[PDB]
Amino acid sequence: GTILIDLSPDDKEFQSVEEEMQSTVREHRDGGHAGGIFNRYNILKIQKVCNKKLWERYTHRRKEVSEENHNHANERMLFHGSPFVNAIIHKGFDERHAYIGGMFGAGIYFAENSSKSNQYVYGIGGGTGCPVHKDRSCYICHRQLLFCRVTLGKSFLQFSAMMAHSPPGHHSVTGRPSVNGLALAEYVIYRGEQAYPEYLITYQIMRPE
Ligand SMILES: COc1ccc(-c2cc3c(N)cccc3c(=O)[nH]2)cc1
Numbered sequence: 125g126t127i128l129i130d131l132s133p134d135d136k137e138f139q140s141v142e143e144e145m146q147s148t149v150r151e152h153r154d155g156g157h158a159g160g161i162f163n164r165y166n167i168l169k170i171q172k173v174c175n176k177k178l179w180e181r182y183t184h185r186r187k188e189v190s191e192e193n194h195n196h197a198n199e200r201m202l203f204h205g206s207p208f209v210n211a212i213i214h215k216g217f218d219e220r221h222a223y224i225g226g227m228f229g230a231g232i233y234f235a236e237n238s239s240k241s242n243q244y245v246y247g248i249g250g251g252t253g254c255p256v257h258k259d260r261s262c263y264i265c266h267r268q269l270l271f272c273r274v275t276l277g278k279s280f281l282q283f284s285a286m287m288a289h290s291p292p293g294h295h296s297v298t299g300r301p302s303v304n305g306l307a308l309a310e311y312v313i314y315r316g317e318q319a320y321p322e323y324l325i326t327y328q329i330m331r332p333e
């Protein structure tokens with residue numbers, strides 16, 4: 125039931141999604157090992173992901189969370205990178221898309237930094253890199269990220285040196301950076317219904333000059 129609608133580069137929606145992608149790139153403590161060496165992206169395409177059933181699954185859960193949190197869904201727009209992006213857009217997020225080994229337990233992880241999610245496009249730690257060249261810093265191969273609508277509800281704050289259940293009385297976990305002053309927050313949900321994959325972004329990382 126999923127259809128993908130291309131956005132024009134002239135459309136304000138394309139431009140605002142591109143700006144979030146580009147402006148949330150940072151340097152990583154791995155020197156580029158997982159995601160590659162780059163300061164910016166070449167955006168090739170942005171598509172709106174449209175699936176009625178999956179949207180209604182998201183909004184149903186959003187109202188449940190809202191009603192448990194003084195009518196406040198605490199909804200964010202966050203990046204997700206995964207080898208399973210094609211399954212996600214067709215079937216929705218579920219337990220199969222969890223990062224079993226993540227620092228906040230087996231859940232589905234989202235980033236404010238697009239460059240954090242980029243580290244996961246080819247697997248955990250960047251896997252072995254792109255399938256064609258086996259290069260984690262490949263500047264040729266096309267990559268894909270999701271920019272997703274995520275319900276956080278009441279989020280458990282984990283101060284952090286950088287499927288399970290949410291902590292009792294909470295709907296998500298927030299990983300607050302406590303060492304790297306430039307890192308933005310990461311978030312974990314434990315129910316696939318608490319995210320909708322709204323934009324599919326196709327891109328290349330760009331080699332710095
Ligand atoms: C291969 O299964 C996985 C898919 C996505 C990720 C992933 C992890 C992650 C993280 N730990 C922090 C912030 C964002 C992400 C993310 O986008 N994907 C991890 C495993």
Ligand SMILES: [Zn+2]
Nearest residue numbers: 254257262265
């Ligand atoms: Zn490649």
